[PDB]
Amino acid sequence: VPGTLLNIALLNLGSSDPSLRSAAYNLLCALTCTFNLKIEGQLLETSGLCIPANNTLFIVSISKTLAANEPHLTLEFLEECISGFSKSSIELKHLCLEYMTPWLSNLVRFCKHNDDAKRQRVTAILDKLITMTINEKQMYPSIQAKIWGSLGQITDLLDVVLDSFIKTSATGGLGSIKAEVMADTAVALASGNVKLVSSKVIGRMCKIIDKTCLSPTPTLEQHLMWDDIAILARYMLMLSFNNSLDVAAHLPYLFHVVTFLVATGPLSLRASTHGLVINIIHSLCTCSQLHFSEETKQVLRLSLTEFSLPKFYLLFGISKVKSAAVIAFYERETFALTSLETVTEALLEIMEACMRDIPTCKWLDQWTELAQRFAFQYNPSLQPRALVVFGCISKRVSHGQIKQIIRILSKALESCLKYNSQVLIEATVIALTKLQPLLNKDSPLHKALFWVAVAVLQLDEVNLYSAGTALLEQNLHTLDSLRIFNDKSPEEVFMAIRNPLEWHCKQMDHFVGLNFNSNFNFALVGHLLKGYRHPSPAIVARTVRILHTLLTLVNKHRNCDKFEVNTQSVAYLAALLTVSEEVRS
Amino acid sequence: VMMARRDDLSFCQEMKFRNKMVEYLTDWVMVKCLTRDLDQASMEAVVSLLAGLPLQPEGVELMEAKSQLFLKYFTLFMNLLNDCSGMSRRLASLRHCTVLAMSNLLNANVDSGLMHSIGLGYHKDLQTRATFMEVLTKILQQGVPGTLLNIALLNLGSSDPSLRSAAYNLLCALTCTFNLKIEGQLLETSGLCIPANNTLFIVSISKTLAANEPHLTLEFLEECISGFSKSSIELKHLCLEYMTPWLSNLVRFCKHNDDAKRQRVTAILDKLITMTINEKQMYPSIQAKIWGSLGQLLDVVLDSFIKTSAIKAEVMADTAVALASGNVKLVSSKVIGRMCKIIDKTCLSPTPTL
Q1: Which residues form the signal peptide (chain B)?
Q2: When you count CB atoms within 10 A of the terminal residue's CB, does the N or C end of chain A come out lower?
Q3: B65 at the A interface (CB within 8 A)?
Q4: Sign of dihedral through CA atoms B312, B315, B321, B327?
């Protein structure tokens, strides 16, 4: 009775009808006396009191004084407000939101208890306020500024608010106008207490990405939780411009989200994810809490420029668009891990630049842990992406981590006996590429990884061969940086590691029909020669660099000139014959 | 092609030549398919002709004649874009070219152009607005504050994403060019995909500016209120929120003794009244934001209400309720005081019947 009658009094005090205003005013007086409602600017019952039509500032004053004084009314009052609001005219709807504005504060009181009924009716009030927001497209900045800005102040409730937003978005997932407006509204939630709201949104995203691994599916877009991720990615774009206030706690977690999403799903989500990064880099150039140098700021400015280039559009699985923004507000490029590698090193150069200036951060270590967790754990959709990223970002590695990676490579090849497996193989090989410069100078593994690359090339899959040659290219740079060739042929070094393996290697070579024991240089060249077929001119040119490297190395242990033809160099020279003007002359 | 090669060619009177060429080709800017291709081609040529072109009619009158010639070309381009507002793509290409024509015309002719250009900033077409704001961006970092600040802020509101990014870059440019002191610092860049709901950000920028940059207030508020009349209901609402901080500054201008500044405050209050009368949906919300804040001048306010009343009169009565909530005692003291003084004034020149 107190709440229902108080709303009907207050709302009627608004009216264009004069008799209605007088009657309402007498009802307010009666409620005040009967329920002893403590009121400033005291209230007097009487007939014929000719109250003005514009009294909004009086109704509002009464309401918030009541909202402080008589808080139990709030549960009933806001429920009744939204019921009357939805029925009323647009003029009455402006008035209605103005009087609603103070009440929102009390909504936390009911929530502390965690018994269903109280928490449920606040949750229903939030869903009704959300519904109201979706419906009244011409009240839209008004609702968001006053209702959602006030709710944005209120920390405790934000988990209930976000689960209401997310469940509202869940009603149809990405492409549902319910979700679309909810994302745009989510910025209003953050605007009051940015750090907690964004921490809960990003936290839900991270936790839900982890939940994908709790029950795996082969492909991420298919996953049981795909809509939940897609919704949060939508929110993250909108928030990301406000993240110009936020980023300093978050930056790793946002790149963790980018890493999984970077070119996935329908093209609007890709555009969103490009925008997410652009906005984060811009936010890192201006957060008033940070103090980056002119060099670091210049690096970020040039990074914005770089991310704005068509190169980065192709990396994010955007093609055939002038502006990512326009589409942000399927023709999957079947995702090329080399694109994620490129993005990840660029985001790494952004983070590294910043981390020099902020010595008190843990950002790259947290990103390393987050990526590491997903790289090692079994989840077919995410694990490849994670491996690539972990490899790119890491600053140290252990033989136990390499064991896990090469075990993942092996298990992925077992799964090929039984597309996803291949992408996991490519990922592991890219990971090995980035990780092998990190490995200790006296580790056997540098030499071992040359054979991992050889085995990968043997597979005959276009992207696997590209990855194996990247691994091999980087491996030979690594071993030359370790001086290892200076007193030995590559043949002796790699064949020593084969000797224990030799029982296994014999079976490989006899099924391949290449035999390194009989002639090492020609077998290695046999593998490399397929690289000349490769559809991509970049992989051919890499293959040529590898042959040049090997040619130089074989002669390096003799102390010969690199073009001295001999029983070891000749294979490389014959391989190089269509591609090197230096060899030809 | 000739204009592309203009850097190679020789000219005795290049500026006059290009001026006369735009004058001629603009006559062509008006079988239907071919005439529309002629419009496209003519406009593409005009975009080439206008590229660093100072205007030259055939000294103080010359600057005013240059402004009048600017207004002719500019109006013709506006009409052509209104007419725009395979057949679809040709129209969009003509529109994009027309926008670039305005852009180049402005980029050279700044002293003649800027005032009319603000009229582009209001214009109903969001794509044209966004591009025009990038043109303003070129002028302002090369070498106005109130008019441009409103067109930035109001456009940050838009449903169009490209418009929001463009506006945000314009705000950044104005901030740098006019050294406008801002919290939560602002970074110029392409492709920044700003949300549609950013009202709390636009508002925060506005009131921080309203504290920091009071000299803008008259220039800004008048242009905002003009933009109110142009806008959708959503953009009208947003205008109120960001206007609200600025109102407070208006006292500084009537504390100032300049008759022109006192007049401009009075004209702002008249335009606030005009908006208050016209924009009925908003009207309870307008009263709450605008008239409450203004209630915190008040002779001038009441004379503006009374003179405008002299629905207008009813709205002024009903709005006076909001106005009174400010310092109740002073507002009511002035209303009642005017009543008493006017009743006394009846005796200063009597009539038989009241």
Answers
A1: none
A2: C
A3: no
A4: negative
Question: CB under 8 Å, gap of 24 or more: what pairs does A557-561 form?
Answer: A557/A485, A557/A486, A557/A487, A557/A488, A557/A489
Question: How far is A384 from A523, CA to CA, in rounded Å?
Answer: 30
Interchain pair B234, A138: CB under 8 A? yes
| Sequence-ordered list of residues with C-beta below 8 angstroms from that of B88, at least 6 positions apart, any chain | none
Q: Which residues contact B52 (CB under 8 A, 6 or more apart)?
A: B104, B107, B108
Cα dihedral B62, B68, B69, B71 sign = positive
Look-up of token digits 């599916």: A217
447-466 in chain A: CB under 8 A from chain B: none
**Tokens 């009294």 -> residue:** A55
Torsion of CA A129, A135, A139, A145, to 10 degrees: 40
- Give the C-alpha distances (Å, rounded to integers) separating A177 from A183, A184, A426, B176: 10, 11, 38, 38
Dihedral-angle region of residue A48 (phi above 0 means left; psi in -120 to 50 means alpha; beta otherwise)? left
Give the integer Cα–Cα distance in Å for A26 and A291: 60
Neighbours of A275 (CB within 10 A): 29
Contact A95 B284 (CB under 8 A): yes
Residue A148 gets which letter from DSSP? I
Does A378 reach chain B within 8 Å, measured CB to CB?
no
Q: Where are the alpha helices (DSSP H) in A418-489?
A: 420-435, 445-458, 462-481
> Which residue in B245, B167, B134, B147 sits closest to B200, CA to CA?
B245
Resolution of this deposited model, Å: 6.2
DSSP three-state, residue A31: helix
Give me B89's structure tokens.
Answer: 């793509």
Please indicate whether, in this complex, the C-beta atoms of A145 and B199 are within 8 angstroms of each other: yes
Q: Which residues contact A323 (CB under 8 A, 6 or more apart)?
A: B162, B191
Interchain CB contact of B10 with A (< 8 Å)? no
Q: What are the φ/ψ torsions at residue A304 (nearest 5 degrees)?
A: -55, -45
Buried b (16+ CB within 10 A) or exposed e, A69-108: ebbebbbbbbbbbbebbeeeebbbbbbbbbbbbbbbbbbb
Q: After which residues is chain A broken (C to N over 2.5 A)?
A: 329, 418
CA dihedral A66, A68, A72, A73 (to 10 degrees): 30
Q: Distance (Å, rounded) from C-alpha A194 to C-alpha B299?
A: 43
A536 close to A463: Cβ distance less than 8 angstroms: no
Residue of B nearest to A242 (CA): B201
Instruction: Report the alpha-carbon distance of residue B9 to residue B3 in Å, rounded.
Output: 9
The token duo for A322 is 């002038």
Q: Are A573 and A582 in contact (CB under 8 A)?
A: no
How many CB atoms neighbour CB A199 within 10 A?
17
Q: Identify how the structure was determined.
A: cryo-EM
Are A191 and B201 inside 8 Å of each other by CB? yes
